[PDB]
Each structure stands twice: as C-alpha cells, then as structure tokens.
Design a protein around this nucleic acid. Structure first.
Ligand SMILES: [Mg+2]
Ligand SMILES: [Mg+2]
Ligand SMILES: [Mg+2]
Ligand SMILES: [Mg+2]
Ligand SMILES: [Mg+2]
Ligand SMILES: [Mg+2]
Ligand SMILES: [Mg+2]
Ligand SMILES: [Mg+2]
Ligand SMILES: [Mg+2]
Ligand SMILES: [Mg+2]
Ligand SMILES: [Mg+2]
Ligand SMILES: [Mg+2]
Ligand SMILES: [Mg+2]
Ligand SMILES: [Mg+2]
Ligand SMILES: [Mg+2]
Ligand SMILES: [Mg+2]
Ligand SMILES: [Mg+2]
Ligand SMILES: [Mg+2]
Ligand SMILES: [Mg+2]
Ligand SMILES: [Mg+2]
Ligand SMILES: [Mg+2]
Ligand SMILES: [Mg+2]
Ligand SMILES: [Mg+2]
Ligand SMILES: [Mg+2]
Ligand SMILES: [Mg+2]
Ligand SMILES: [Mg+2]
Ligand SMILES: [Mg+2]
Ligand SMILES: [Mg+2]
Ligand SMILES: [Mg+2]
Ligand SMILES: [Mg+2]
Ligand SMILES: [Mg+2]
Ligand SMILES: [Mg+2]
Ligand SMILES: [Mg+2]
Ligand SMILES: [Mg+2]
Ligand SMILES: [Mg+2]
Ligand SMILES: [Mg+2]
Ligand SMILES: [Mg+2]
Ligand SMILES: [Mg+2]
Ligand SMILES: [Mg+2]
Ligand SMILES: [Mg+2]
Ligand SMILES: [Mg+2]
Ligand SMILES: [Mg+2]
Ligand SMILES: [Mg+2]
Ligand SMILES: [Mg+2]
Ligand SMILES: [Mg+2]
Ligand SMILES: [Mg+2]
Ligand SMILES: [Mg+2]
Ligand SMILES: [Mg+2]
Ligand SMILES: [Mg+2]
Ligand SMILES: [Mg+2]
Ligand SMILES: [Mg+2]
Ligand SMILES: [Mg+2]
Ligand SMILES: [Mg+2]
Ligand SMILES: [Mg+2]
Ligand SMILES: [Mg+2]
Ligand SMILES: [Mg+2]
Ligand SMILES: [Mg+2]
Ligand SMILES: [Mg+2]
Ligand SMILES: [Mg+2]
Ligand SMILES: [Mg+2]
Ligand SMILES: [Mg+2]
Ligand SMILES: [Mg+2]
Ligand SMILES: [Mg+2]
Ligand SMILES: [Mg+2]
Ligand SMILES: [Mg+2]
Ligand SMILES: [Mg+2]
Ligand SMILES: [Mg+2]
Ligand SMILES: [Mg+2]
Ligand SMILES: [Mg+2]
Ligand SMILES: [Mg+2]
Ligand SMILES: [Mg+2]
Ligand SMILES: [Mg+2]
Ligand SMILES: [Mg+2]
Ligand SMILES: [Mg+2]
Ligand SMILES: [Mg+2]
Ligand SMILES: [Mg+2]
Ligand SMILES: [Mg+2]
Ligand SMILES: [Mg+2]
Ligand SMILES: [Mg+2]
Ligand SMILES: [Mg+2]
Ligand SMILES: [Mg+2]
Ligand SMILES: [Mg+2]
Ligand SMILES: [Mg+2]
Ligand SMILES: [Mg+2]
Ligand SMILES: [Mg+2]
Ligand SMILES: [Mg+2]
Ligand SMILES: [Mg+2]
Lengths: 56, 119, 209, 123, 114
RNA sequence: CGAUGUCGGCUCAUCACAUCCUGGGGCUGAAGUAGGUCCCAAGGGUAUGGCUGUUCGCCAUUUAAAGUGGUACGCGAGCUGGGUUUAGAACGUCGUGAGACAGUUCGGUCCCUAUCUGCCGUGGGCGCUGGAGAACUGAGGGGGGCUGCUCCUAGUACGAGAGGACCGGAGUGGACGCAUCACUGGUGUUCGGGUUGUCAUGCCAAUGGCACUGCCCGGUAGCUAAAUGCGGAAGAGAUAAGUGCUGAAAGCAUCUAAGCACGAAACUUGCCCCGAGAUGAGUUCUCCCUGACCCUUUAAGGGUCCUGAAGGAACGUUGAAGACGACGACGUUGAUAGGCCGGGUGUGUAAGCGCAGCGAUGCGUUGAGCUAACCGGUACUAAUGAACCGUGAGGCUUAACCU
RNA sequence: AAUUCCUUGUCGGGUAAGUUCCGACCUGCACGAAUGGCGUAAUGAUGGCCAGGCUGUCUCCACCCGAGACUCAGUGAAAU
RNA sequence: ACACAGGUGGUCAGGUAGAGAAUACCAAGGCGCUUGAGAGAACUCGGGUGAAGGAACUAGGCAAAAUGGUGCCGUAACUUC
RNA sequence: AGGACCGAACCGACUAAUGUUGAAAAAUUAGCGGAUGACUUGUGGCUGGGGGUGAAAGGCCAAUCAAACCGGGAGAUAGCU
C-alpha cells in the first residue's frame, strides 16, 4: 500500500528518465503558401498540399 | 479483444452514437464542411457517404430511408436535390478529412470533414 | 526432411464418399525458392534458406535485394531456414514445390497463434474463478493466492499470472495430410493450424510420425 | 450431455418414469455422459407395479440426449429430452423388455444390441 | 477467398432442391450397418436453414414414436442421398424454433399455395 | 503486547519422500488370477456428493489411485466469514446478586490507490568497437511427461477344476494441455423483423425518439466451448534397486577387487517454446560510406567547410498486432483504411401502387426491401515534395600469408 | 428440547448417501407449572428442514453493452 | 467543513395510457449534473444473452432467475369460525 | 368497522452489492416493512447530569455517554512508559 522508506531524488530522477518530451521531428512547408505546418495537417492559413482548403 | 471489429465506441452508448451521428451528418450536409474530432470525422464518413449513395437515386422509398436515417426533411431535400446529382458520377468517397491540429480545451486532434465538391 | 513455407488460406471440409467430413486447413504453398545453402565449412551446420511469395521492389531494401540477387532469385516476402538431414542437397536457385509432400502422411505446422493481448489468469491458464456471489468482494476473476507466508517469502518464477497470451510461435504436430494439389499450390491438412487467415506457416514432415 | 443431478426420462418399460444420474462412470473427474454411456442412477419415480422401485440405485445407458450426437459428416441428431434405459448393476443388461421412442446408431455395439433390436426406430 | 471458394465449389452438390423453412421434407440418408448400405428416410418440418455454400445445413424436426427429434443435415454431405419436398409450408420466419414448444394442433403450419 | 489477524472453505500453489496409482525389482506360506512383504523410484497423476462451520469422520457412488507430510499446521494489503472472539437476547446450570459457563441457542461492520523485494508481461537506453538490413547457431532456461477399458495373442501358459496370465500388438476412452472456428452451438445493445405504451415528424400512410437494447424473435463477422484437430511417445545415453558373465584375493566359491553385460515413468537427451545483455555480447549472407583544409598542449585531440549513404526514425492510412510502447502491412510506381461496385450472409415478401374485403387485414407487384465487422474488385477520399536522424572506409599489438 | 454432557443416543420417516429436519422412545448430565407448564388458529423482513418452479449459485465459463482501469491534454491529493 | 449523490415543513397538480399523486412517454417550464479527447487489454463496477445440466454452489438458494394484472371458475388440513 | 388487507406519498431500515483516504464521519442502488394509527409531521414549549428521558438497547440527552459539555480545583496523581 505505502512506501516503507522514502525513495531518493536519485530514484525519482531515474523514474522520470522516461518523462522527456519529444520535439516534432520536422515541420513541412506548404508548397504554395510557403509556411510551416505539421505533416498532414493544414497550415494556419488554411493551406494543405498547396490548395486553399478552408476560407478564413 | 477486438479482432476484425468495426465501429468506434467513442465513449458513448449505442443510442447516443446513433443520435450524435445523425446530428453530425445533418450538420455536414447542411454546411458542407464541419470541424470535429478526427476519430468522429473518420466514423462520420461511414454515416454520411452511404446517405449520398442512397440519395443518388431519387425515389419515395429512398427519400423515406434517408429521412429515417437523418430525421430532417431539409437535409433529405438537400441530399436528393443537390448532392445526389452533384455526386452522381463519383464512385464513392464524397467527403474529405483535413487534419487541423488540436483543441485548446482538451488537446483533441481535430479535423475538417468536407464534401469533396464544395469549393 | 525439409519443410516448406506456406500461407494459411482458411478452413473448409472435405467430404469423403464414405460419408466423413474432414475439417481441413488449406495452406497455399507457392514455390519455395532457395536463397542460401549452409554447410559445415562456412556456417558450421547444414541448412537451406528459402523464400516464398513476392515483395514490392520499393520495400525490398538494398541489403535484402543484394542477398536475393546473389541467390539469383526474385525477392520474397521473407526468409526461412530449414535444417538439412544427412545426404540432403539443394542448390542455391532451386524452387521447391508443394509436390514435396506428395508422399508424406503427417506434417507439423508451425505458425504464430492469434494474439489475445493481455489475458487474465482465467483465460491464460484456465484458472478457476471464485464465487460470483456468496459474499465475494471484488475477487471474481482475480488469481487468488500467489504464494506462501514468509517461507519462501517470495513468488516463485514461472508463477502463472496474467500477461500476453497468444501471438507466439506454436507448432501443432502430426496433422494428417489430406491432399497435395501441386497444380494449385495447395496443401490440405486435417484439423486446425496456428495463426490467423493469411499468416505464414512452416510445414515440415512430422517429426514424430 | 448428462451429469450428476440430471433427471432422465426412461426409454424402457422397467417401471421407472424419472431417474437421476448420480454418477458418470468410466474415468476420474468425468463430467458428462452422452448417448451410449453408462451412468449410475437413482430412481425418483416409478409405476406402482414395475420391475424397479423408487429409490433403487442401479445403472443405465443414456440413449437420447437433448444435446444430441454428432455424426462423421458433421450432422447432429438432437432429441427433445434426455432418456436412458435401465440396466442391471452387474450384467448391465436392460431390465425392461421394451424400448420406447427412437434410439441412435451409437448404441450399435455388442453391449446394447438387445436395446438396438428392441428399439422401435434407430436414427 | 478464391482458393477456398473453388475448393468448396468443386465439391458442392448440383441437385439440391429449393426448400424453405416450414416445408416438410423427406431426407433420404445413407445408413451403413453391417456391410450393406441402405437408405433411411427422415421426414419432418424444416425449422432452420443455414446457407453457407458447402457448409450449408438444414434442421428437420419430426415426432417419431412420441419423442421430438431434430436432425441437422449438412446439405452437401454425401450421407444425405436425397431431399424431397412433400409439403410446402407457409411461415413468416426464417427459423421456426417456436415449434419446439408446440405439439399437435398448436404445431400445425399451414400450406403455402400458388 | 507503540498489534506477527485465528478454524474451516475458496483461489493459487510449491517442496519432501516415510510412494496411493502408474514404472523397475527381490522374497513369498508366489501354480495362474489375485495377493503379502521389502527394495528402487517423486516423471506425471492422485474423486464427486449427503451430514456437519468443520478439519476429521461416517455414509452413497466413483477412480489406476482417491498418498503422507512441510510450506506462519502455505495462502484474509487474494476472497469468504459458517465456527471462533465484543456489545442484544434466551435456555440449562452456578451464584443472594451483579454476573458466569472447554454448555447450548438466535442475531451480529473483514479497511488499505503497491514505494521496495518478488512474480507475470511489455517497452525505452546503452553495450556488443565503422554503420546498417536480415537469417541463424545454441550456452542456458522453460513446457510437456497421467492413465482406463476393450480386442488380438489366447481360453493359450498355469490349473483337478474353478478360473486364468506374463511378454507383445491393435483400437477406443477419461482427465489435462496446445491450437482453431470448417462444423455443432453460444454471443453478437453495430444487421433484419415483430410488437406494447407514448411523443414527435402538419395529417393519412410511413418513420424516428423514449420506455433495461422497451419487450421480444432471429442473426453476419469477430470472440468463443459444450465444438474438433493435435499432444504425452518411440528411440538413444548413463544409471537405481536388482540380475548377471568372466574372475582372483581366498587352489574352492564369489556380480568385483581388474575387466565385461543388462537394468525403471527417476537423470541426460530425443518433442515443443524462449533464448548471444551467452558483457564468454557468437556465426553467416547482403548492403552503404573511397572529400577538403585548420589546429597544438600531437593523439583513439579539437575545429570549419563540403558531404548525408545503406538504413532508420518521424508522419499518415492502418492490422485477425496491441493497455501504452512494441510488432506487422501500406503511403500514388498505392488496395493501407474508408467509401463505391458486385457477391455473400442475415432477416423475411419493404415502400408505393393496385385489387379483394364493411373493416381489421389479405393477395399481387415480391423471396421483396434492407443488410455490421465477410468475400472479390474498384484510386472516389485519405495515405505529400520534402524535412529529420544516421556519415565520409572504421584503434593498437602480434602472427600468418600476399609483393 | 432455544434445555441432553455422554451424543452424530436409539428406533422410524425423508435422501443414493441426512452430525441438520420431522415422529417417537425416556437413560430429564441439568424440563416443569404466572422469573409460568403444555397446546394454540392467525400473524412474523424471526430460527431450522423439505419440495415444486426457477435459474450462471454451480459443472464452467463464453460473448456482449456501458462506467473505470490504459494513452493524450488540464488540474492535482493521501496514508507512509 | 465543499458549488458535498445526504437532510429540509407547506401549496400548486396539464395530456395519453393507467385504479392511481404508481409507472411510461409528453406539456408548461426547467435542465444535460464545471474536466475533456481517444483507446476498446487484464481486472473491478453496473447490466444483457447463454448450449447441455438445474442447487451438483454454499454455512445457507446468498445473489440472481422466477411469480406478478383484471374478470371468471376453483381452492385443503386446521380454525379462536 | 378495523392498532383489517394490497399499494404511492410519508415513516422506517430486513438482505445484497458498491462504497470504506467514500458523493456520504452510515450513504447509494436493487429489493424490503408499516402505510387511519400504540401513525407521521411542522411550529413552540417542558424535563439537566448521579440528573433527565427510556414500549428497556445501558438506549438517548447537539457526530461526545456505565455518568454530557465548558470553565475551574489543576502543574490531580502516575512505584509506569
Ligand atoms: Mg519499519
Ligand atoms: Mg512516467
Ligand atoms: Mg475492419
Ligand atoms: Mg472518457
Ligand atoms: Mg434506448
Ligand atoms: Mg489480438
Ligand atoms: Mg469453481
Ligand atoms: Mg466490502
Ligand atoms: Mg461483485
Ligand atoms: Mg503481542
Ligand atoms: Mg511496530
Ligand atoms: Mg524410497
Ligand atoms: Mg512384490
Ligand atoms: Mg509430486
Ligand atoms: Mg515433480
Ligand atoms: Mg526432480
Ligand atoms: Mg525424463
Ligand atoms: Mg505443522
Ligand atoms: Mg495456516
Ligand atoms: Mg498443507
Ligand atoms: Mg497473505
Ligand atoms: Mg481465514
Ligand atoms: Mg501480509
Ligand atoms: Mg459468524
Ligand atoms: Mg450479552
Ligand atoms: Mg533492450
Ligand atoms: Mg528440458
Ligand atoms: Mg464456429
Ligand atoms: Mg466464420
Ligand atoms: Mg458465430
Ligand atoms: Mg399513423
Ligand atoms: Mg414508436
Ligand atoms: Mg422526447
Ligand atoms: Mg423521457
Ligand atoms: Mg448462430
Ligand atoms: Mg524410453
Ligand atoms: Mg546402457
Ligand atoms: Mg562360475
Ligand atoms: Mg574361479
Ligand atoms: Mg506413461
Ligand atoms: Mg478500400
Ligand atoms: Mg491496381
Ligand atoms: Mg439471402
Ligand atoms: Mg411492399
Ligand atoms: Mg419495416
Ligand atoms: Mg410469392
Ligand atoms: Mg434476401
Ligand atoms: Mg451489398
Ligand atoms: Mg478486399
Ligand atoms: Mg437441561
Ligand atoms: Mg449434542
Ligand atoms: Mg439424534
Ligand atoms: Mg436417523
Ligand atoms: Mg438436499
Ligand atoms: Mg442440507
Ligand atoms: Mg426428534
Ligand atoms: Mg424453565
Ligand atoms: Mg407453583
Ligand atoms: Mg415460579
Ligand atoms: Mg411464556
Ligand atoms: Mg494526466
Ligand atoms: Mg504530505
Ligand atoms: Mg458541481
Ligand atoms: Mg446537494
Ligand atoms: Mg397522472
Ligand atoms: Mg412518477
Ligand atoms: Mg461533474
Ligand atoms: Mg469493456
Ligand atoms: Mg439475465
Ligand atoms: Mg441477441
Ligand atoms: Mg443455461
Ligand atoms: Mg436463442
Ligand atoms: Mg436451455
Ligand atoms: Mg449441497
Ligand atoms: Mg460442496
Ligand atoms: Mg434472495
Ligand atoms: Mg430479478
Ligand atoms: Mg393496517
Ligand atoms: Mg428507530
Ligand atoms: Mg431503499
Ligand atoms: Mg402495506
Ligand atoms: Mg455527570
Ligand atoms: Mg447488557
Ligand atoms: Mg449522539
Ligand atoms: Mg463518575
Ligand atoms: Mg490541588
Ligand atoms: Mg499532569
């Protein structure tokens, strides 16, 4: 149920060893608007793979 | 397990899923593009596209089936008078999923689902 | 003696004129075609590596492609070794047909069983469930006791617990060969073999017989 | 598919109307008896003047099951109820002289050929 | 799959008569007893049909000698030598399991004509 | 004693061997069958019920057998709570009494989200000395190992008969285990239909909502057992008790001292699975990289430019793979998923119209309409050109070859 | 026997089998007459026992539907 | 102690079905309960279905399943009638 | 007529499961008893601690009861830890 000794800051760090975030590997650039975006997502302007897909 | 099973539960019961997908299919027919979560858009393909397939051939029986599936007369009218004829030659795939990031409130992966011949 | 690599196609029945329905697993055995021959001098043991099927050239990597090119054979969907018995010879480019099993009466079929994911002890080990009623608090499919008190003061290795079930290599032995159809590349064996439809199967002449 | 506490009808004229399986014979921990299987029974119901008496402990051969029997072609023969023929404890010969209702081919064996012959119909 | 379908097709019978649930059928089956094959008839109401190509089956229910007897035939089994429709029955269900709790007049099913 | 929770049951065990069964063997007051006793042997197996809280026991019926013990008389941070051991109450009994009882009786709160060890699984890191993709080897580890009955041998051997074998062979079972879904079934709130009440869609008709999926009847795929396939072995090695051969010490005898042989479910293998973090980090096959200059504290040094491969990752469509990771398939040179088309399957003859009928309803159109996960196809939609990581021939010393 | 230790008394019934139950017997360890005796229809969320029906209580579990559990985003404890 | 499934006296009392102020669906009216998104493992919780068997479970049929309405017919011992 | 019957409200609380660092310092859900009475309920009042009140359980008397709470004697005493 509960700890019998206080785990160390060492043990806590070793547990958090796997808590690291992963940066997005690389952003794509829309071929028309030229702006960066996630792979397979539309750009913030509403571009995807060149064509304007949503009116702003 | 889940071998070869189809259909997302979406953390709802069956009646809620059916009702929600009626509302969302009606919204998509009405507006021709909606923003919703990516899993719901993927599941909405299988509700909306059969309706367009049904609407390609106009008969009283097909109108009534579409009205049973959608329970909205103006949605049925738009289907059978616009999208059936608009999609007559298109062999399926009447919608398009466009991923659009994440909601602020819950970080849900969002997507636009639109009719293919909208713009 | 060597086996072939086939694919599980499905299950059906064979009606005999006598009146018996034989449940058969249908196994498509395309031409197994040799890629490497191993021997005591270079490898320290005798075996043939064979491939089967086909693979997209755009997913055959250059290491794989060069291996297949050295064999002088089309890329398959995988590579499997079979140990050779005494006085058993194959050349690097041979195609081995299902006709190999035209004589043999029983085979052993190895596959990857269907994966059941993380299974409870009831499913995985046939544990008896506890009482569904009669006061049982939250303990209907739980495994019960897992050890003894202070001696040994631990849980033993190999203790039957919940975990991954299936999705592992399973060999079913001494399946009777019902039909060898070399024309259509079929091997029909009586009974069920491990794996799902369309999964890879290793078929050897039965070791026990 | 008969187990302990199962009530069987009686396909013979030994006198019993209802019997209960109290033991599935022929193996440790054996769960069920199908057709052709010998079970231990106690007689729960009998006619006033019959060969057998209520509360008698004896043997029986299961002849019809509601679970049914499979045939080599995969066919199954089911019955509307479970029924057995009473047998002597020692000889394991039927006590009655008449077999009621149909029986099946799984009885065709020297142990129960008398039952097979006496039966009106053999599926 | 094409392979399994071909394997079952080259094995299916080509002469199975069209019958429906509620039909009374006489199924003549091969009985081997001793060293001699004879042909035993089983007649009754079709209470269920499973159409699965080679794995098609049908259930026939009769009352023989007082006992209710159901028999599931594998349609394309060589054991089933023949099927004949004696009476053509009018029902609205695909599977007549409700006849299991019926005897006599209650178990009557009317004949579909025309 | 600043708490180590009792009996029994359940669940799950694990070890011992003083062995219940199965296996081997000696003696027998062992003819055979069946026994008795002792020795070896722990591989596997080793009841369900009735009564009682029971353990036990008795009984009923099984079984090859229903072993004996250790494990906090294993197992309550796993369950129960019948017994026991609080407070209520009663009886017998004791006591003037309060009350009490190795008496009885009825009733009577069982907490803990797991940090560490352990265990079952499943990943991330680095290592394995250039990197990468595969296929392996097999140190080691684990799993498995049970048995009935019938027939043949043969009514033979044995026996006065009654009875009735060893050895050997064949078949078919029980329990257990693995796999699987072709069958038989279950399920199948994602399919079809029936139907009650009610509300709504303006109304009729037709539908939808809600009522446990409203209640039901069926049922696809998947998953499943009760379904059906398969398994335990054979063989080999070394042995146990035991049996011997030859054979002295000890002129004989002696299974032993030298030598030689046989000998069991035990051991090592043989079968299945894991498995090179096997840091002792192994092998084989294939693939990739063949540029410049600076630097000083000059060495397995650091730097800049150029270069960025094999491959990997990431992303996306996903899977009979899956908690998540992982693993597999696919990404336009594409069937990966959805849709679409055809089929199948299931349900059971839709709607509309017509006719018959006073009407409910029936008949016809019509085996209609609808039909999930299935099958076969189909680029319609979505799987993007990239970018990212990963480099640029890979230390020293010896030895052997090559020139 | 809400009372009986011996005791699971004995006999009978019920069950295949019944330390419980019911009916008796009387050997009342240690019932007994208003701290009432013995009966008693009706009543009882009362105690015991039996039977029919019913059933996942069980043989022996399977599948399914939902809420968690699991992953992501936000907030963010506790005993020890 | 909380924007806490608890407690808090009185009045009002629509429709369809219904005996009903039960219950179901609705009206007027008022709400969706102040974390969401996915996934669809074990296991836990609350439910549905279940072959064959049917109390073999267990201390005990605990829990489930079952019965269930109105009219009518019919209804035992015993009884304080 | 009835401390009559079945059954909502209302009053209770027999079983079960959950919950047991709870939604809750006693509840939830499914069942369950009473439901014209020795009923239930609002408002106000009275009974005060060796006292009350008790269809009696040592029950209850402000989450406290084999002698309430609060303050005081008081830094009781503690051969104990
Ligand atoms: Mg400590
Ligand atoms: Mg973490
Ligand atoms: Mg799918
Ligand atoms: Mg959620
Ligand atoms: Mg609903
Ligand atoms: Mg899986
Ligand atoms: Mg059990
Ligand atoms: Mg509890
Ligand atoms: Mg529970
Ligand atoms: Mg102590
Ligand atoms: Mg302590
Ligand atoms: Mg010994
Ligand atoms: Mg002996
Ligand atoms: Mg042992
Ligand atoms: Mg052992
Ligand atoms: Mg050992
Ligand atoms: Mg061994
Ligand atoms: Mg001890
Ligand atoms: Mg103990
Ligand atoms: Mg023990
Ligand atoms: Mg413990
Ligand atoms: Mg205990
Ligand atoms: Mg402990
Ligand atoms: Mg108790
Ligand atoms: Mg007391
Ligand atoms: Mg690793
Ligand atoms: Mg081993
Ligand atoms: Mg199946
Ligand atoms: Mg299938
Ligand atoms: Mg199925
Ligand atoms: Mg209408
Ligand atoms: Mg309706
Ligand atoms: Mg509504
Ligand atoms: Mg409502
Ligand atoms: Mg089915
Ligand atoms: Mg051997
Ligand atoms: Mg040897
Ligand atoms: Mg000699
Ligand atoms: Mg000598
Ligand atoms: Mg053996
Ligand atoms: Mg597709
Ligand atoms: Mg193509
Ligand atoms: Mg069809
Ligand atoms: Mg119609
Ligand atoms: Mg309809
Ligand atoms: Mg017609
Ligand atoms: Mg059809
Ligand atoms: Mg279709
Ligand atoms: Mg396809
Ligand atoms: Mg007394
Ligand atoms: Mg006594
Ligand atoms: Mg007695
Ligand atoms: Mg007695
Ligand atoms: Mg009983
Ligand atoms: Mg009892
Ligand atoms: Mg008595
Ligand atoms: Mg007295
Ligand atoms: Mg007196
Ligand atoms: Mg007196
Ligand atoms: Mg009195
Ligand atoms: Mg979080
Ligand atoms: Mg703290
Ligand atoms: Mg709130
Ligand atoms: Mg509140
Ligand atoms: Mg009303
Ligand atoms: Mg109401
Ligand atoms: Mg909330
Ligand atoms: Mg679930
Ligand atoms: Mg149910
Ligand atoms: Mg169903
Ligand atoms: Mg059942
Ligand atoms: Mg059914
Ligand atoms: Mg049934
Ligand atoms: Mg019992
Ligand atoms: Mg028991
Ligand atoms: Mg109950
Ligand atoms: Mg119920
Ligand atoms: Mg009253
Ligand atoms: Mg009270
Ligand atoms: Mg309540
Ligand atoms: Mg009442
Ligand atoms: Mg006081
Ligand atoms: Mg007291
Ligand atoms: Mg109080
Ligand atoms: Mg005092
Ligand atoms: Mg003083
Ligand atoms: Mg002091």
């Amino acid at each position: 149920a509960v700890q019998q000794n206080k785990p160390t800051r060492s043990k806590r760090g070793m547990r958090r060893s796997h808590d690291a975030l992963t940066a997005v590997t690389s952003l794509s650039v829309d071929k028309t608007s030229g702006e960066k975006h996630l792979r397979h997502h539309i750009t913030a302007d509403g571009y995807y793979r060149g064509r304007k897909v949503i009116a702003k | 397990m889940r071998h070869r099973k189809s259909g997302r539960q979406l953390n709802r019961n069956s009646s809620h899923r059916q009702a929600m997908f009626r509302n969302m299919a009606g919204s998509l027919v009405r507006h021709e593009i909606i923003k919703t979560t990516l899993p719901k858009a993927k599941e909405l393909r299988r509700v909306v596209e059969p309706l367009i397939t049904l609407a390609k051939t106009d008969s009283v029986a097909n109108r009534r089936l579409a009205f049973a599936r959608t329970r909205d007369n103006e949605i049925v009218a738009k289907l059978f008078n616009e999208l059936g004829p608009r999609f007559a030659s298109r062999a399926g795939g009447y919608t398009r999923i466009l991923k659009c990031g994440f909601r602020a409130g819950d970080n849900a992966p969002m997507a636009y689902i639109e009719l293919v011949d909208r713009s | 003696m060597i086996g072939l690599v086939g694919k599980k196609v499905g299950m059906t029945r064979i009606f005999t004129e006598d009146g018996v329905s034989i449940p058969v697993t249908v196994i498509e055995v395309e031409a197994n075609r040799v890629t490497q021959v191993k021997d005591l001098a270079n490898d320290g043991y005798r075996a043939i590596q064979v491939t089967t099927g086909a693979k997209k050239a755009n997913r055959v990597t250059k290491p794989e492609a060069g291996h297949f090119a050295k064999a002088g054979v089309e890329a398959g969907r995988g590579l499997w070794e079979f140990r050779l018995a005494e006085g058993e010879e194959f050349t690097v480019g041979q195609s081995i047909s299902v006709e190999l099993f035209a004589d043999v009466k029983k085979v052993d079929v190895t596959g990857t069983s269907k994966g059941k994911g993380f299974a409870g002890t009831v499913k995985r080990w046939n544990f008896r469930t506890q009482d569904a009623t009669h006061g049982n608090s939250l303990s209907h499919r739980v495994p019960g006791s897992i050890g003894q008190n202070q001696t040994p003061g631990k849980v033993f290795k190999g203790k039957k617990m919940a975990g991954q079930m299936g999705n592992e290599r399973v060999t079913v032995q001494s399946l009777d060969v019902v039909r060898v159809d070399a024309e259509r590349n079929l091997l029909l064996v009586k009974g069920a073999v491990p794996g799902a439809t369309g999964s890879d199967l290793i078929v050897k002449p039965a070791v026990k017989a | 598919m008969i187990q302990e506490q199962t009530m069987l009808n009686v396909a013979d004229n030994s006198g019993a109307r209802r019997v209960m399986c109290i033991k599935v014979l022929g193996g440790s921990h054996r769960r069920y008896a199908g057709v052709g299987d010998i079970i231990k029974i106690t007689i729960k119901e009998a006619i006033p003047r019959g060969k057998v008496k209520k509360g008698d402990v004896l043997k029986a051969v299961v002849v019809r099951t509601k679970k049914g029997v499979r045939r080599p072609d995969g066919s199954v023969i089911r019955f509307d109820g479970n029924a057995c023929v009473l047998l002597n404890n020692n000889s394991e010969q039927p006590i009655g002289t008449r077999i009621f209702g149909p029986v099946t081919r799984e009885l065709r064996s020297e142990k129960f050929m008398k039952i097979i012959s006496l039966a009106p119909e053999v599926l | 799959s094409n392979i399994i379908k071909q394997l079952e097709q080259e094995q299916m019978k080509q002469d199975v008569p069209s019958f429906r649930p509620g039909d009374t059928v006489e199924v003549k089956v091969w009985v081997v007893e001793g060293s001699k094959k004879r042909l035993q008839a089983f007649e009754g109401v079709v209470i269920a049909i499973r159409n699965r190509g080679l794995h098609s089956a049908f259930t026939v229910r009769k009352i023989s000698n007082g006992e209710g007897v159901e028999r599931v035939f594998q349609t394309h089994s060589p054991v089933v030598d023949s099927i004949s429709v004696k009476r053509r029955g009018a029902v609205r269900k695909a599977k007549l399991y409700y006849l299991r709790e019926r005897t006599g007049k209650a178990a009557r099913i009317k004949e579909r004509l025309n």
